Amino acid sequence: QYDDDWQYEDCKLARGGPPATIVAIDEESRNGTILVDNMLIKGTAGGPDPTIELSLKDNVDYWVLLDPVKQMLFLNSTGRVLDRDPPMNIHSIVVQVQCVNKKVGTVIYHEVRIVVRDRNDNSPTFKHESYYATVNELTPVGTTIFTGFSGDNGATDIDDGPNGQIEYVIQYNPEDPTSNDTFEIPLMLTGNVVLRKRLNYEDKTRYYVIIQANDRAQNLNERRTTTTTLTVDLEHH
Amino acid sequence: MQVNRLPFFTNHFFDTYLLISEDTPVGSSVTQLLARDMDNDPLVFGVSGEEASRFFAVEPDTGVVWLRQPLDRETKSEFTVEFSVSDHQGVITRKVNIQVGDVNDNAPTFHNQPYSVRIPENTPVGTPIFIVNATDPDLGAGGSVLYSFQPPSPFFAIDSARGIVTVIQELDYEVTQAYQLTVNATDQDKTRPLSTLANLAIIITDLE
Ligand SMILES: [Ca+2]
Ligand SMILES: [Ca+2]
Ligand SMILES: [Ca+2]
Ligand SMILES: [Ca+2]
Ligand SMILES: [Ca+2]
Ligand SMILES: [Ca+2]
Ligand SMILES: [Ca+2]
C-alpha cells in the first residue's frame, strides 16, 4: 500500500535541485568560514527525539566541520592555511555528509563539493637578481637588444590564470634619465627590449634600464609588481 | 604609436563555476562566452587543451559553446576548461571550473548472483537466512538502495535497508518444497526511481 512511506522521508533532501551541494570559497579563507549555510536535509538530528544521524565521510585532512543540529558546514583551518597555489595545490575539497535514517536504517550520502578560488596572493619573481646586455654602438634603431626574459628566465608568478601571467614595462630611472627614452618594450607580454635611439660610445657607455614586472589581475589595484634592472653596456666599433 | 588594448572575458562564471547537467544532449548550447575589447576589435573565441577540445566546440564569432560528446558524472565529476579570446594582436585565456551535475541514470546492480539457499523445514521464525546486495553509483537518494519482495511473501521478509532475508512463518516441507521469490532493488530518486529484479531460490530440506 505504501502507507508507512512517510518514515522513509527523513534523510532525503528537503530542497529541490540536483543531489550534490556545490559551494565556492577563496583560498586562505579564515578558520570558521561558513561553507554551507544549511544542508536542507529532511529530518532532525538533535532535539528531544532525533529522526536522523548526520556525520562526515571522506573528510580528508579534516578541512570541514559539521554541526549536525543546525546542519552547518564550516572551514577548519586553525594553525594552517587553505592554499590553492603550489606546493599545496588545493583546487577543490569533496566530502560526504552521511545521513542515517534512525527509524528505518537507510543511509543516504549527500556529496559536498567545494570549489577553491585563486586569489592574487603572490607577486612576480625574477629568476635572476639582475639582468644584462651588450650592444654594439652601430646597432640600428629598431633592433631587439635583450631577450633574457624568454622561457621563464624572467618573471614568473605562482598564482593561476591572469593572476600569474606577466607584463613588463620600462620605468623612468632618476639615476639614468635617458634610459627609458633610448629603450622600449613594444610587446609588454614578452619583455623584449629594443633600441629606440641612436647610440654613441664617445658620449655614454652604460644605461641602467629599470623594468617592472606586474601580474594581470582583473582588478587593476589587486595587481602586484616586482622591479629589476637591465644594465646595457656599449661595446666599441 | 597607438598600443593595443587586450580583450577580457566578462562572464560571471569565471569568478565562480559553471554547472552542466550530465543529461545535457550532445549538440546543446551550454553557455555563451562574452568578451569586451576597448578597441572594439573583432574578437575570436576558442577552447584550448586536448581534454577540453573533445568535450566542447566554440562558435568563433558568437561565442556559443556546444557540447561535443556526452558527459558522465559517474566517470568524471568536473573539468577545468581553458577558454580564449583573441583580437588578432593577442590571445588571452581564462580557466573555468565545470561541475558536472548528476541525474539518476543508473538502476542498481546485484552482486553474488545466482541467489540460492538451503534451509531445514524446522528453521525458526525470525531466523536470518540470506543477505542480498545491490549497489547504485548515482548520488544521494538516487544511489541509496531499498530491497523488497515482489510480491511480499507470507513465509519470508527482507529488510529494506540491509537486504537480510528472514523467515516469518513456519515452514512445511510437505506443503511446499521450494520458493522462487523476486527481489526488487530500487533507488530512492524522488521523480525518477530506477530498479532491478533478481531471483532468490529458497530450497527447503526435510528432517523426517
Ligand atoms: Ca595561496
Ligand atoms: Ca593564489
Ligand atoms: Ca600574482
Ligand atoms: Ca584590442
Ligand atoms: Ca551517468
Ligand atoms: Ca548519474
Ligand atoms: Ca540510481
Coordinates of C-alpha atoms and ligand atoms in Angstrom, one line a residue:
Chain A
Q1 CA 0.0 0.0 0.0
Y2 CA 3.0 2.3 0.8
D3 CA 1.1 3.6 4.0
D4 CA 4.3 3.8 6.1
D5 CA 6.4 5.7 3.5
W6 CA 6.5 8.9 5.4
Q7 CA 9.1 7.1 7.6
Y8 CA 11.5 6.8 4.6
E9 CA 11.3 10.6 4.1
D10 CA 13.9 11.6 6.6
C11 CA 17.5 11.9 5.2
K12 CA 16.1 12.9 1.8
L13 CA 16.9 16.5 0.6
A14 CA 14.3 19.0 1.8
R15 CA 15.4 21.3 -1.0
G16 CA 14.9 20.8 -4.7
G17 CA 17.7 20.8 -7.3
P18 CA 20.3 18.3 -8.1
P19 CA 21.9 15.9 -5.4
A20 CA 25.4 17.4 -4.9
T21 CA 25.7 20.5 -2.9
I22 CA 28.2 22.8 -4.5
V23 CA 29.9 25.8 -2.9
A24 CA 32.9 28.0 -3.5
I25 CA 35.4 29.9 -1.3
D26 CA 38.6 31.8 -1.7
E27 CA 41.9 30.3 -0.8
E28 CA 43.3 31.4 2.5
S29 CA 39.8 32.0 3.9
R30 CA 39.8 32.3 7.7
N31 CA 39.1 29.5 10.2
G32 CA 35.4 29.2 10.8
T33 CA 34.1 30.5 7.5
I34 CA 30.6 29.1 6.8
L35 CA 30.9 26.7 3.8
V36 CA 27.2 25.7 3.8
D37 CA 24.5 27.8 5.5
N38 CA 22.2 24.8 5.8
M39 CA 22.3 21.4 4.2
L40 CA 18.5 21.3 4.0
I41 CA 18.3 17.6 4.8
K42 CA 14.8 16.4 5.8
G43 CA 14.6 15.3 9.4
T44 CA 16.2 16.3 12.7
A45 CA 19.5 15.4 14.3
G46 CA 19.3 16.6 17.9
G47 CA 16.2 17.7 19.8
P48 CA 14.1 15.6 22.1
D49 CA 13.6 12.8 19.6
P50 CA 16.1 12.8 16.7
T51 CA 15.0 11.1 13.5
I52 CA 18.4 11.2 11.7
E53 CA 22.2 10.8 12.3
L54 CA 24.5 13.2 10.4
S55 CA 28.3 12.7 10.2
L56 CA 31.1 13.5 7.7
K57 CA 32.8 10.9 5.5
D58 CA 35.9 11.2 3.2
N59 CA 36.8 14.3 5.1
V60 CA 40.4 14.1 4.1
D61 CA 42.7 16.3 6.3
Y62 CA 39.6 17.5 8.3
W63 CA 39.0 20.7 6.3
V64 CA 35.3 20.5 7.2
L65 CA 33.4 20.7 10.5
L66 CA 29.8 19.7 10.8
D67 CA 27.1 21.0 13.3
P68 CA 24.5 18.2 12.9
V69 CA 21.7 20.2 14.7
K70 CA 21.9 23.3 12.6
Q71 CA 23.3 21.3 9.6
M72 CA 26.1 23.7 9.0
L73 CA 29.5 23.1 7.4
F74 CA 32.5 25.2 8.5
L75 CA 36.0 25.5 7.3
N76 CA 38.5 24.1 9.8
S77 CA 41.9 25.7 9.2
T78 CA 43.4 26.6 12.6
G79 CA 47.2 26.6 12.5
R80 CA 47.3 26.3 8.7
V81 CA 46.1 27.9 5.5
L82 CA 43.9 26.8 2.6
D83 CA 46.4 27.3 -0.2
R84 CA 45.3 26.8 -3.8
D85 CA 48.8 27.7 -5.1
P86 CA 51.7 25.3 -5.1
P87 CA 53.0 23.5 -3.2
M88 CA 49.6 22.8 -1.5
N89 CA 47.6 22.8 -4.7
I90 CA 44.1 22.5 -3.2
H91 CA 41.8 23.3 -6.0
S92 CA 38.7 21.6 -4.6
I93 CA 37.5 19.7 -1.4
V94 CA 35.0 16.9 -1.7
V95 CA 33.3 15.4 1.4
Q96 CA 30.2 13.3 2.1
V97 CA 27.5 14.2 4.6
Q98 CA 26.3 10.9 5.8
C99 CA 22.6 10.8 6.9
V100 CA 21.4 7.6 8.6
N101 CA 17.6 7.4 8.9
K102 CA 17.0 6.2 12.5
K103 CA 13.6 4.7 12.1
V104 CA 14.3 2.5 9.0
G105 CA 18.2 2.4 8.9
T106 CA 18.6 3.6 5.4
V107 CA 21.8 5.6 4.5
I108 CA 22.0 8.4 2.1
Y109 CA 25.3 10.3 1.3
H110 CA 24.9 13.9 0.3
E111 CA 28.0 14.9 -1.6
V112 CA 29.5 18.3 -0.9
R113 CA 31.9 19.8 -3.4
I114 CA 33.9 23.0 -2.5
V115 CA 35.5 25.0 -5.3
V116 CA 38.5 26.9 -4.1
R117 CA 39.0 30.2 -6.0
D118 CA 42.5 31.6 -6.7
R119 CA 43.5 34.9 -5.0
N120 CA 46.3 37.1 -6.3
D121 CA 48.2 36.5 -3.1
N122 CA 51.7 36.1 -4.8
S123 CA 53.9 38.6 -6.6
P124 CA 56.1 38.0 -9.6
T125 CA 59.6 36.7 -9.0
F126 CA 62.6 37.3 -11.3
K127 CA 64.7 34.2 -11.7
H128 CA 67.9 36.3 -11.6
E129 CA 68.6 39.2 -9.3
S130 CA 69.6 41.5 -12.2
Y131 CA 70.0 41.3 -16.0
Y132 CA 72.5 42.4 -18.6
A133 CA 73.0 43.1 -22.3
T134 CA 75.9 44.1 -24.5
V135 CA 75.2 46.2 -27.6
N136 CA 77.4 47.4 -30.4
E137 CA 77.3 51.2 -30.9
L138 CA 76.4 50.8 -34.6
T139 CA 73.3 48.8 -33.7
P140 CA 70.5 50.5 -35.6
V141 CA 67.3 51.8 -34.1
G142 CA 64.6 49.2 -34.1
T143 CA 66.8 46.2 -33.3
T144 CA 66.0 43.9 -30.4
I145 CA 68.8 44.0 -27.9
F146 CA 67.6 42.0 -25.0
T147 CA 65.7 38.7 -24.9
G148 CA 66.6 37.4 -21.4
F149 CA 63.1 37.2 -20.1
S150 CA 62.3 34.5 -22.6
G151 CA 61.4 31.0 -21.4
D152 CA 60.9 31.5 -17.7
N153 CA 64.2 33.2 -17.2
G154 CA 62.5 36.5 -16.3
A155 CA 59.4 36.9 -14.1
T156 CA 57.0 34.2 -13.2
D157 CA 54.1 34.2 -10.7
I158 CA 52.8 31.0 -8.9
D159 CA 49.2 32.2 -9.0
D160 CA 46.7 30.9 -11.6
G161 CA 45.4 32.4 -14.9
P162 CA 45.9 36.2 -15.3
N163 CA 47.0 36.5 -11.6
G164 CA 50.1 34.5 -12.7
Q165 CA 50.9 36.0 -16.1
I166 CA 53.3 38.9 -16.5
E167 CA 53.6 42.3 -18.2
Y168 CA 57.0 44.1 -18.4
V169 CA 57.2 47.9 -18.6
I170 CA 60.3 50.1 -18.5
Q171 CA 60.3 52.7 -15.7
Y172 CA 61.8 56.2 -15.6
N173 CA 65.2 56.0 -13.9
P174 CA 66.1 59.1 -11.9
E175 CA 69.7 57.9 -11.7
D176 CA 69.8 57.4 -15.5
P177 CA 67.1 59.7 -17.1
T178 CA 67.7 58.8 -20.8
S179 CA 67.5 55.1 -20.4
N180 CA 63.7 54.9 -20.7
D181 CA 64.0 57.1 -23.8
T182 CA 66.7 55.1 -25.5
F183 CA 65.0 51.7 -25.0
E184 CA 61.4 50.4 -25.2
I185 CA 59.4 47.3 -24.6
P186 CA 56.9 47.3 -27.6
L187 CA 55.4 44.0 -26.5
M188 CA 54.8 44.0 -22.8
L189 CA 53.9 40.3 -22.7
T190 CA 57.4 39.3 -23.9
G191 CA 59.5 41.9 -22.2
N192 CA 62.0 42.0 -25.1
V193 CA 63.8 45.4 -25.2
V194 CA 64.5 47.2 -28.5
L195 CA 66.7 50.2 -29.2
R196 CA 64.8 53.4 -29.8
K197 CA 67.6 56.0 -30.2
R198 CA 71.0 56.1 -31.8
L199 CA 73.9 55.1 -29.6
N200 CA 77.3 56.9 -29.2
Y201 CA 80.3 55.2 -27.4
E202 CA 82.1 58.6 -27.2
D203 CA 79.3 60.2 -25.2
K204 CA 77.8 57.4 -23.0
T205 CA 78.8 53.7 -22.5
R206 CA 76.2 52.4 -20.0
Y207 CA 72.5 52.5 -19.5
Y208 CA 70.6 51.4 -16.4
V209 CA 67.2 50.3 -17.6
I210 CA 64.6 49.7 -14.8
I211 CA 62.0 47.2 -15.8
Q212 CA 58.9 46.4 -13.7
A213 CA 57.0 43.1 -14.0
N214 CA 53.3 43.3 -13.0
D215 CA 50.8 40.4 -13.0
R216 CA 47.5 40.7 -14.8
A217 CA 44.8 40.6 -12.0
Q218 CA 41.3 41.6 -13.1
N219 CA 41.2 44.4 -10.6
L220 CA 44.0 46.9 -11.5
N221 CA 44.5 47.7 -7.8
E222 CA 44.9 44.0 -6.9
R223 CA 47.9 43.7 -9.2
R224 CA 51.3 43.1 -7.9
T225 CA 54.7 44.2 -9.2
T226 CA 58.4 43.4 -9.0
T227 CA 61.3 45.5 -10.2
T228 CA 64.6 44.5 -11.8
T229 CA 67.4 46.4 -13.6
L230 CA 68.8 45.6 -17.0
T231 CA 72.3 47.1 -17.4
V232 CA 73.2 47.7 -21.0
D233 CA 76.9 48.1 -21.8
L234 CA 78.1 49.5 -25.2
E235 CA 80.9 47.8 -27.0
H236 CA 83.3 49.6 -29.4
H237 CA 83.4 49.8 -33.3
Chain B
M1 CA 52.1 54.9 -31.9
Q2 CA 48.7 53.6 -30.5
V3 CA 49.2 50.5 -28.4
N4 CA 46.6 47.7 -28.5
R5 CA 44.3 47.0 -25.5
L6 CA 43.7 43.3 -25.0
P7 CA 40.3 41.8 -24.6
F8 CA 38.9 40.3 -21.4
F9 CA 36.1 37.9 -20.6
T10 CA 33.1 39.2 -18.8
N11 CA 31.1 36.0 -18.0
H12 CA 30.2 35.7 -14.3
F13 CA 31.1 32.0 -14.1
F14 CA 34.8 32.7 -14.4
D15 CA 34.6 34.1 -10.9
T16 CA 32.6 31.1 -9.6
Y17 CA 32.0 27.9 -11.6
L18 CA 29.8 26.5 -14.3
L19 CA 27.3 23.8 -13.7
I20 CA 26.3 21.5 -16.6
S21 CA 24.0 18.5 -16.1
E22 CA 25.1 15.1 -17.2
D23 CA 21.9 14.6 -19.2
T24 CA 22.7 17.6 -21.5
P25 CA 22.5 16.3 -25.0
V26 CA 25.4 16.4 -27.5
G27 CA 24.8 19.5 -29.6
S28 CA 23.3 21.6 -26.9
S29 CA 24.5 25.1 -26.3
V30 CA 26.0 25.0 -22.7
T31 CA 26.9 28.7 -22.5
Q32 CA 27.9 31.7 -24.4
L33 CA 31.3 33.4 -23.8
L34 CA 31.3 37.1 -23.5
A35 CA 34.2 39.5 -24.1
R36 CA 35.0 43.2 -24.2
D37 CA 37.8 44.9 -26.2
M38 CA 38.0 48.6 -25.8
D39 CA 39.4 49.0 -29.3
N40 CA 36.2 47.1 -30.4
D41 CA 38.4 44.8 -32.4
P42 CA 36.6 41.8 -34.0
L43 CA 37.1 39.0 -31.5
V44 CA 37.7 35.3 -32.0
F45 CA 36.7 32.7 -29.3
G46 CA 38.3 29.3 -28.8
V47 CA 38.9 26.4 -26.4
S48 CA 42.4 25.2 -25.5
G49 CA 43.6 21.7 -24.3
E50 CA 43.2 18.2 -25.6
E51 CA 40.6 17.2 -22.9
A52 CA 38.7 20.4 -23.2
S53 CA 38.6 20.4 -27.0
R54 CA 37.0 17.0 -27.4
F55 CA 34.2 17.8 -25.0
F56 CA 33.5 21.4 -26.2
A57 CA 33.2 23.2 -29.5
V58 CA 33.1 27.0 -29.6
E59 CA 31.5 29.1 -32.3
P60 CA 34.3 31.7 -33.2
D61 CA 32.3 34.8 -33.8
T62 CA 29.2 34.5 -31.5
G63 CA 31.0 32.5 -28.7
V64 CA 28.3 29.9 -28.1
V65 CA 29.8 26.8 -26.6
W66 CA 28.4 23.4 -27.6
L67 CA 28.8 20.0 -26.0
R68 CA 30.5 17.6 -28.5
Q69 CA 30.4 14.3 -26.6
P70 CA 28.3 13.1 -23.7
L71 CA 29.3 14.0 -20.1
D72 CA 29.1 11.3 -17.4
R73 CA 29.1 12.3 -13.7
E74 CA 29.9 8.7 -12.9
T75 CA 33.2 8.9 -14.9
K76 CA 34.3 12.5 -14.4
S77 CA 32.6 15.0 -12.0
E78 CA 34.5 18.1 -13.0
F79 CA 36.9 19.6 -15.5
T80 CA 38.9 22.7 -15.6
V81 CA 38.4 24.2 -19.0
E82 CA 40.7 26.9 -20.5
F83 CA 38.9 29.4 -22.9
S84 CA 40.5 32.0 -25.1
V85 CA 39.5 35.2 -26.8
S86 CA 41.8 37.0 -29.3
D87 CA 41.8 40.2 -31.2
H88 CA 44.4 39.5 -33.9
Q89 CA 47.2 41.1 -32.0
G90 CA 46.9 38.9 -28.9
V91 CA 45.2 35.9 -27.3
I92 CA 44.0 35.9 -23.7
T93 CA 42.9 32.9 -21.7
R94 CA 40.9 32.2 -18.6
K95 CA 40.1 28.9 -16.8
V96 CA 36.6 28.0 -15.6
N97 CA 35.7 25.1 -13.2
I98 CA 33.0 22.9 -14.7
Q99 CA 30.9 20.9 -12.3
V100 CA 29.1 18.0 -13.8
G101 CA 25.6 17.7 -12.3
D102 CA 24.2 14.2 -11.6
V103 CA 20.9 12.7 -12.6
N104 CA 19.6 9.3 -11.6
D105 CA 20.7 7.4 -14.7
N106 CA 21.6 4.1 -13.1
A107 CA 19.5 1.3 -11.8
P108 CA 21.0 -0.9 -9.0
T109 CA 23.2 -3.9 -9.9
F110 CA 23.0 -7.1 -7.8
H111 CA 26.1 -8.9 -6.7
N112 CA 26.9 -12.6 -5.8
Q113 CA 24.1 -14.0 -8.1
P114 CA 22.8 -16.5 -8.5
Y115 CA 20.9 -16.4 -5.2
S116 CA 20.0 -19.8 -3.8
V117 CA 19.9 -21.1 -0.2
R118 CA 19.0 -24.3 1.5
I119 CA 17.2 -24.3 4.9
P120 CA 15.6 -27.0 7.0
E121 CA 11.8 -27.0 7.5
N122 CA 12.2 -26.5 11.2
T123 CA 14.1 -23.2 10.8
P124 CA 12.6 -21.0 13.5
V125 CA 10.5 -17.9 12.8
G126 CA 12.8 -14.9 12.8
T127 CA 15.9 -16.7 11.6
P128 CA 18.1 -14.6 9.2
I129 CA 18.8 -16.9 6.3
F130 CA 20.4 -14.9 3.5
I131 CA 21.7 -11.5 2.6
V132 CA 21.1 -9.9 -0.8
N133 CA 23.2 -7.0 -2.1
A134 CA 22.9 -4.4 -4.9
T135 CA 24.9 -1.1 -5.5
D136 CA 24.0 2.1 -7.3
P137 CA 26.6 4.7 -8.2
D138 CA 24.3 7.7 -8.6
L139 CA 24.5 10.4 -6.0
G140 CA 22.3 10.8 -2.9
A141 CA 18.7 9.4 -2.9
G142 CA 19.3 8.0 -6.4
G143 CA 22.2 5.8 -5.0
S144 CA 20.5 4.6 -1.8
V145 CA 19.1 1.1 -2.4
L146 CA 15.9 -0.4 -0.9
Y147 CA 15.1 -4.1 -1.1
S148 CA 11.7 -5.7 -1.3
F149 CA 9.9 -8.9 -2.5
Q150 CA 7.6 -8.6 -5.4
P151 CA 5.1 -9.5 -4.2
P152 CA 5.6 -9.8 -0.5
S153 CA 5.7 -13.4 0.8
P154 CA 3.8 -14.9 3.7
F155 CA 6.9 -17.0 4.5
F156 CA 9.8 -14.6 4.1
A157 CA 10.6 -10.9 4.7
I158 CA 13.5 -8.8 3.5
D159 CA 14.9 -5.9 5.5
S160 CA 14.6 -3.0 3.1
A161 CA 17.8 -1.2 4.1
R162 CA 20.1 -4.2 4.8
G163 CA 18.8 -6.9 2.4
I164 CA 18.7 -9.6 5.2
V165 CA 16.1 -12.3 4.4
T166 CA 14.4 -13.8 7.5
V167 CA 11.7 -16.5 7.9
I168 CA 8.4 -15.1 9.2
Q169 CA 6.1 -18.1 9.2
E170 CA 6.6 -21.8 10.0
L171 CA 7.8 -23.9 7.0
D172 CA 6.1 -27.2 6.0
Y173 CA 8.1 -29.3 3.6
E174 CA 5.0 -31.4 2.7
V175 CA 3.0 -28.3 1.6
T176 CA 5.9 -26.5 -0.3
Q177 CA 9.3 -27.8 -1.2
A178 CA 10.9 -24.7 -2.9
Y179 CA 10.2 -21.0 -3.3
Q180 CA 11.0 -18.7 -6.2
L181 CA 11.0 -15.1 -4.9
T182 CA 11.7 -12.0 -6.9
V183 CA 13.8 -9.4 -5.0
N184 CA 13.5 -5.8 -6.1
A185 CA 16.3 -3.3 -5.6
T186 CA 15.3 0.3 -6.3
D187 CA 17.0 3.5 -5.6
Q188 CA 15.1 6.3 -4.0
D189 CA 15.2 9.1 -6.6
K190 CA 12.3 11.4 -6.0
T191 CA 10.8 11.8 -9.5
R192 CA 12.7 9.0 -11.5
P193 CA 13.4 6.0 -9.3
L194 CA 15.1 3.0 -11.1
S195 CA 15.1 -0.6 -10.1
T196 CA 16.3 -4.1 -10.9
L197 CA 14.9 -7.6 -10.3
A198 CA 16.8 -10.6 -9.0
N199 CA 15.7 -14.2 -8.3
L200 CA 16.0 -15.7 -4.8
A201 CA 15.6 -19.5 -4.6
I202 CA 14.8 -20.9 -1.2
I203 CA 15.1 -24.7 -1.1
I204 CA 13.6 -26.5 1.9
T205 CA 15.2 -29.7 3.2
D206 CA 13.3 -32.2 5.4
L207 CA 14.1 -33.8 8.8
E208 CA 11.8 -36.8 8.9
Ligands
CA1 CA 48.0 31.0 -1.7
CA2 CA 46.8 32.4 -5.4
CA3 CA 50.2 37.1 -8.8
CA4 CA 42.3 45.1 -28.8
CA5 CA 25.9 8.8 -15.9
CA6 CA 24.1 9.7 -12.6
CA7 CA 20.3 5.2 -9.3

